[PDB]
Structures are given as structure tokens and as C-alpha cells.
Design a protein around this ligand. Structure first.
Ligand code: A1AYX
Length: 209
């Protein structure tokens, strides 16, 4: 059973701007997703400070980067607080409507796409490099769900019957044909060292056979 939703007009406009604008500095997508993961890890850590049972779904707080050249996917896994179904539908837990409004004024007032994260909509920079994005998520207060969009104005949400996650979020980037450099180990290492050197959680770059 799959539910199909329309993006809010303002979010559809944000996504088409990211996809259509000529902008060479695409590598910032990874900084933005890692920062989102760090934010989600901060949230579950804070909750566990007064309620240790919040970590019964997993004590380890970490970020994994998993390239797969056969599937042409880059997966960013974190064990953060995760998202409920309501969070997923409500623009993946963001205030994307007002964030987009602010972001798009900044773009006409000088800024560039790389500054997207300051407006709370950094997730959508995934469409700089991905033709399709799948988000698998598990929050302590809900079931495991899969969100998916190839842009084009709609997304789907379904109950996820795949591998149970315990707690957290998995962003699966189905990369564009000309963006496979972000599956190469030395390119990912360079980007993490350049933009994410001070993230306070272990970032593990998986290797392939
Ligand atoms: N807001 C707004 C419009 C805008 O320029 N968005 C944009 C464009 C290219 C890349 C990114 Cl990451 C974002």
C-alpha cells in the first residue's frame, strides 16, 4: 500500500531550482546530509540525557557512508532520532515552506546554492546529484517508513518491509549517470575532510568488494 502526495508548491519550486540551475559546486550535498544526520544524533542524545531507555533501540550514535557502484547508490545512514510518518509527510521534519521563502530571497540578494543549509532545507540539495532519493526512517514513537521522490511534484510514503533499522534515518541517493564520482573512495574522503572535519560523531566510509 503506497500513498502518493503532492509537494507544497513552494517545495516543488525549491526542488526544480536545485535541479535546473547551473551550479558546479555539487559536492555540498554531502556536507548538508551529514549535518542533518549530526542534528538528528544531537536530538536523540539530548533525549537520552533524562531518559536512558530512549537508546533501547540502539546505543551507538554514528554516521555510515555506503557507496554501491553496482546499484549506483550512495547511502548515508545515521542512528539519530529518526522521523515519524507525520514528520516525513511534513517535509521530512523541516519548516521547508518558510525556509524556502528565505533561501530564495537570499539567492536574488547575492547568496548561492551552497548556503542552503542555513535555511533548514539542506536535505533537498540531494537533488544536485540524485535522480531519485529514498529515505528509510525509524523513530522510537512510530513504525519504519520509506519516503521516496524523483521530484516532478510528488513523493510517496509506504510502510517499509525491508531490513529493520532499530532507530535512525537512511538516505539512499540514486545518483545521476554523470555523478558517479561520489561513489569513489578518494572523492568521498576529500569531501568529508573538506566540509565535515568537525562533526562530533564517527563517520565510517564503507569500502566495496
Ligand atoms: N531558494 C532557491 C533557489 C535556488 O537558487 N536554489 C538552489 C539552486 C541550486 C542549487 C541549490 Cl543547492 C539551491
Amino acid at each position: 500500500e503506497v500513498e502518493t502526495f503532492a509537494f507544497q508548491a513552494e517545495i516543488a519550486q525549491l526542488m526544480s531550482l536545485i535541479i535546473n540551475t547551473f551550479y558546479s559546486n555539487k559536492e555540498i550535498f554531502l556536507r548538508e546530509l551529514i549535518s542533518n544526520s549530526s542534528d538528528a544524533l544531537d536530538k536523540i542524545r539530548y533525549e537520552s540525557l533524562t531518559d536512558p531507555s530512549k537508546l533501547d533501540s540502539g546505543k551507538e550514535l554514528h554516521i555510515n557512508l555506503i557507496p554501491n557502484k553496482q546499484d549506483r547508490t550512495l547511502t548515508i545512514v545515521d542512528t539519530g532520532i529518526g522521523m515519524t510518518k507525520a514528520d516525513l509527510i511534513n517535509n521530512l521534519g523541516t519548516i521547508a515552506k518558510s525556509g524556502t521563502k528565505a533561501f530564495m530571497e537570499a539567492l536574488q540578494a547575492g547568496a548561492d546554492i551552497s548556503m542552503i543549509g542555513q535555511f533548514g532545507v539542506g536535505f533537498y540539495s540531494a537533488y544536485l546529484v540524485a535522480e531519485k532519493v529514498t529515505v528509510i526512517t525509524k523513530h522510537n514513537d512510530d513504525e519504519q517508513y520509506a519516503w521516496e521522490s524523483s521530484a516532478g511534484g510528488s513523493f510517496t510514503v509506504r510502510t517499509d518491509t525491508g531490513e529493520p533499522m532499530g532507530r535512525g534515518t537512511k538516505v539512499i541517493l540514486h545518483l545521476k549517470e554523470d555523478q558517479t564520482e561520489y561513489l569513489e573512495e578518494r572523492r568521498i574522503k576529500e569531501i568529508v575532510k573538506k566540509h565535515s572535519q568537525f562533526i562530533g560523531y564517527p563517520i565510517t566510509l564503507f569500502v566495496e568488494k
